[PDB]
Amino acid sequence: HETGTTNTATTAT
Amino acid sequence: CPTHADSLNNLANIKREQGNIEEAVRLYRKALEVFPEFAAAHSNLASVLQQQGKLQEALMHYKEAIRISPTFADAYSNMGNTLKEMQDVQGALQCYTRAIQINPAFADAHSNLASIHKDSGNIPEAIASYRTALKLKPDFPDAYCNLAHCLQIVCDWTDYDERMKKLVSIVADQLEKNRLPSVHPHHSMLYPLSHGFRKAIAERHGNLCLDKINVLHKPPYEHPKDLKLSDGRLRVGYVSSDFGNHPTSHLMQSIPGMHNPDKFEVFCYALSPDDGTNFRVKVMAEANHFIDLSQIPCNGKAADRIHQDGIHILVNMNGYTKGARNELFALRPAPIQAMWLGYPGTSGALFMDYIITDQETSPAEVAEQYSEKLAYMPHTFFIGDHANMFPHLKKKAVIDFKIYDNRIVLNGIDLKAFLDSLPDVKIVKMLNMPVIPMNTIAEAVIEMINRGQIQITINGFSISNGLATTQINNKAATGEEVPRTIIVTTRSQYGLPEDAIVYCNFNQLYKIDPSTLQMWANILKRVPNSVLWLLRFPAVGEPNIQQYAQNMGLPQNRIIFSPVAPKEEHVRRGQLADVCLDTPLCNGHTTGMDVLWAGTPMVTMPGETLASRVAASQLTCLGCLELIAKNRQEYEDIAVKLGTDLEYLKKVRGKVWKQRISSPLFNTKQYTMELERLYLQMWEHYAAGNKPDHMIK
Ligand SMILES: O=C(O)CCCOc1ccccc1[C@@H](NS(=O)(=O)c1ccc2[nH]c(=O)ccc2c1)C(=O)N(CC(=O)O)Cc1cccs1
């Protein structure tokens, strides 16, 4: 199966 | 005020972490109302849309974010993840490499790139990229756990004990903090996690499907409560991405056509397009109805189609494997939904009612490992099409190159007819086995093998080199067709010794752990000349296995690797082994059926997970209880006895050879009848107004 990935959450500054 | 848009975006991030995806989308969108050129909000919104299955809308917002901010590395990496999910591997790679070019210290992008290498078969590059990720971000559960699986794949057991400790610790922390565990459910069977942790892992992956159907805002379906609309027939639908050249079809392709049309109407829902193989042709022709759901990508429309067919029992054959669309089951288009055959574990999900298994595989005392109710088949839930696909292996002959049953082997549909022309064959009582003496014909056959010839002709019969099947008939090599020629298989073809015991295991190397190889070393050390025959899957795992074996006292020449072979050759060459040693961590499943069909006894030690008990279920149905070990000591003693008491080995091999035919193990007709009785128990139970309960008879 497809290996999962990691989404990056961008903090607003 | 800038804090307005920033506050909305950052609050949405929190909601996203908490699992409140709907609220997150709302806040992201409000942030974009306040500040339309808000790159971070575009990319964060796209991330939650991706999580909801709205992939094209996600891409649009990733592109907006990058239009606003051309060096926005987060957006490129997130976009890569979306392209990867859409099967656009080149697009994903170009995004990841752009992200890393912008920011070489971007740990997430290194880990996501590593996932492409892992899936592409480039395990060394995957390991390197995951290690860069963990160097940049030492607390990175996705990277650590996927690195751990890379190391499992190649049998790198460096600090294996500490690795397992950290894996279990990571899962425990994620489960406690209500997060999606970084260990995939299909992989959880390989690690020393509790049954509760494994079921919770499955439940939380199943919950991912809910996020994707909730956006459809579809109401509950009305289900049939009788068989009147179907003329008394129970409507069974099989859902699979694997109607094609895939192990699942190699197991059950005969079953749709064997259902009793007087009591059952069979619907096969393909999640994959037609791969052009005979496997797909057969199911499409023998099912009462065949529906190509690959043409209906929306799960809401696809479920509507299932419901419109009036399905009573919908059968999930994927679980958490490639190609699954469990969103279809999450929508509950059928009143009874069951797991079957394709996935060796629980869904952990509320929308599956039953798992079809058996008392050996899943004894009632371990029902807590499954979220589903147990539905027992009478013997084993496993089945295989070997009697239909490989009938040329029903009989065999040998050449007396001096008598062995597994040094030089001939198989063929016309094998008996060929032996009639040979006025000097000897029949050996052990059915019995014809033995070709070392005559002119035998010398020509052995010359073909030694010289590497493709095939020869004797008395009009084609005699084929077993290593050249793809050059003779590619459809025969894959199992799509029964070979037409007489095939020659020899130990010399695989570098195996003529005068020693061969223990084989043809499983993926990630099913081997240090404990298993220690047990195998213990066996080899007690059988002086024996060798271990393993599979290069992958080849880069070979030097690791050799290292650890030599570390345990086994010279390198005691372990012999062979490459992956076409399906037919893989099953046929199992005849060259004396004994198959099953992997206790995760048994062979298809490969267990393959080795038994070749007549090779398999030794197994059933564990506690479903995946660790399949081989003992197969052997119980076959009728060889003496090959099932209760502990490691018995496992070793059984294997050593088979390898040292050659009269006992002959008796056991004769038993497997005969009972593969006389037992229910490969009897697809009997299997379907018992499967049908189980379906009716489910239906009559539901029809009487009852919720699912254990169908353990
Ligand atoms: O564990 C399970 O029950 C199935 C797991 C998943 O299998 C999948 C999934 C997707 C597509 C293909 C496959 C395998 N097909 S197959 O099982 O029918 C098959 C076919 C030829 C083979 N030749 C050999 O020499 C040794 C084994 C072998 C097995 C397959 O082909 N494999 C080899 C490869 O991909 O190159 C995977 C392996 C499974 C077991 C050992 S390797």
DSSP line for B4-73: HHHHHHHHHHHHHHHT-HHHHHHHHHHHHHH-TT-HHHHHHHHHHHHHTT-HHHHHHHHHHHHHH-TT-H
Which residues does B contribute to its contact with A (CB < 8 Å)? 5-6, 9-10, 13, 16-17, 38, 40-41, 43-44, 47, 50-51, 74-75, 77-78, 80-81, 84-85, 108-109, 111-112, 115, 118-119, 140, 142-143, 146, 182, 184, 186, 320-322
Structure determined via: X-ray
Distance CA B49, CA B406 (A): 58
Phi, psi of B137 (to 5 degrees): -135, 85
Task: Evaluate whether B663 touches B623 at the Cβ level (below 8 Å).
Answer: yes
- Cβ proximity of B405 and B433 under 8 Å: yes
Q: How far apart are CA B288 and CA B492, in angstroms?
A: 47
Q: Specify the DSSP element, H or E, that contains B148.
A: helix B141-153
Beta strands in B271-318 (DSSP E): 289-292, 313-316
Ligand 1, atom nearest to B573 Cα? 25
Annotated binding site of B for UDP: 508, 511, 565-567, 570-573, 589-591, 594
What is the rounded end-to-end Cα distance, in angstroms, of chain A?
38
Token readout for B581 is 């040693």
Select from B412, B565, B548, B404 the least CA-distant residue to B477: B565
In whole angstroms, how far apart are CA B119 and each of B37, B89, B149, B153?
36, 10, 12, 12
Structure tokens of B429? 């009582």
Instruction: Give yes or no for a contact between B86 and B94, defined as CB atoms under 8 angstroms apart.
Output: no
Angle between helices B107-120 and B89-102 (to 10 degrees): 150
Tell me the three state secondary structure of residue B627: helix
* Distance, CA of B69 to chain centre: 43
Kindly name the residue from B42, B61, B149, B186 that is annotated as catalytic: B186
Evaluated on CA atoms B13, B19, B20, B24, the torsion sign reads positive
CB contact under 8 A, B81 and A1: no
- B146/A3 CB distance under 8 A: yes
Which residues line the pocket of ligand 1, CB cutoff 6 A? B 246-247, 250, 506-508, 535, 537, 564-565, 567, 570, 589-591
What is the H or E stretch that residue B463 is in? strand B461-465
Which of A6, A12, A13 lies at the smallest CB-CB distance from B112?
Answer: A6
Angle at B646 between CA B642 and CA B648, to 5 degrees: 60
**In this structure, how many other beta carbons lie within 10 angstroms of the beta carbon of residue B69?**
18
The Cα–Cα gap between B604 and B595 comes to 13
Q: Select the residue of A1, A7, A12 nearest B10 (Cβ to Cβ).
A: A12
In angstroms, rounded to a whole number, what is the distance separating the alpha carbons of residues B190 and B611?
A: 9
Contact A12 B38 (CB under 8 A): yes
Residues of chain A with C-beta less than 8 angstroms from the C-beta of B146: 3-4
Best residue for ligand 1 mutational test, from B322, B567, B576, B580 (most atoms within 8 Å of Cβ): B567
Task: List CB contacts (< 8 A) between B10 and chain A.
Answer: 11-12
List CB contacts of B548: < 8 A, sequence separation 6 or more. Answer: B155, B157, B514, B517
Bridge partners, residue B237, by sequence: B267, B314
**Minimum CA distance residue for ligand 1 atom 29:** B567
Closest CA to B273 of B254, B308, B247, B246: B246
In this structure, how many other beta carbons lie within 10 angstroms of the beta carbon of residue B479? 25
Q: Return the structure tokens found at B373.
A: 């109710």
CB nearest A11 (choices: B10, B119, B140): B10
Active-site annotation holds for B184: no
DSSP state of B379: S
Sign, CA dihedral B318-B323-B326-B332, equals negative
- Residue B638 near residue B603 (C-beta atoms within 8 A): yes
Q: How many CB atoms lie within 10 A of CB B540?
A: 16
Long-range CB pairs of B206-210 (<8 Å, 24+ gap) are B206/B326, B206/B330, B206/B347, B206/B348, B206/B349, B206/B350, B206/B351, B207/B349, B208/B51, B208/B180, B209/B326, B209/B327, B209/B329, B209/B330, B209/B349, B210/B330
Note the helical H segments in B72-136.
73-85, 89-102, 107-120, 123-136
Q: Which helix (H) or strand (E) holds B268?
A: strand B264-270
Reduced to 3 DSSP states, what percent helix, strand and coil does chain B have, rounded to the nearest 5? 50, 10, 35
Q: Are B464 and B457 in contact (CB under 8 A)?
A: no
**Distances, alpha carbon B34 to alpha carbons A9, B9, B10, B31, B670, in Å:** 19, 11, 14, 5, 67
Residue B11 and residue B23 in contact, taking contact as beta carbons nearer than 8 Å: no
- Per the document, the length of chain A is 13
Distance from CA of A6 to the nearest CA of B (A): 6
Q: Which of B246, B291, B241 is nearest to B266 (CA)?
A: B291
**Residue that has been written with the tokens 């070997």 in this structure:** B386
- Tokens matching residue B161: 């004990």
Q: Say how many CA atoms lie within 13 Å of B463 toward its Cβ.
A: 25
Tokens 């669309």, residue located = B325
Write the DSSP symbol of residue B625. G
Per-position DSSP letters for B571-609, written without gaps between them: HHHGGG-SEEE--SSS--SHHHHHHHHTT--EEB---SS
Contact A5 B80 (CB under 8 A): yes
For residue B335, count CB atoms less than 10 angstroms from its CB and return exposed for 0-12, middle for 13-18, buried for 19 or more: buried
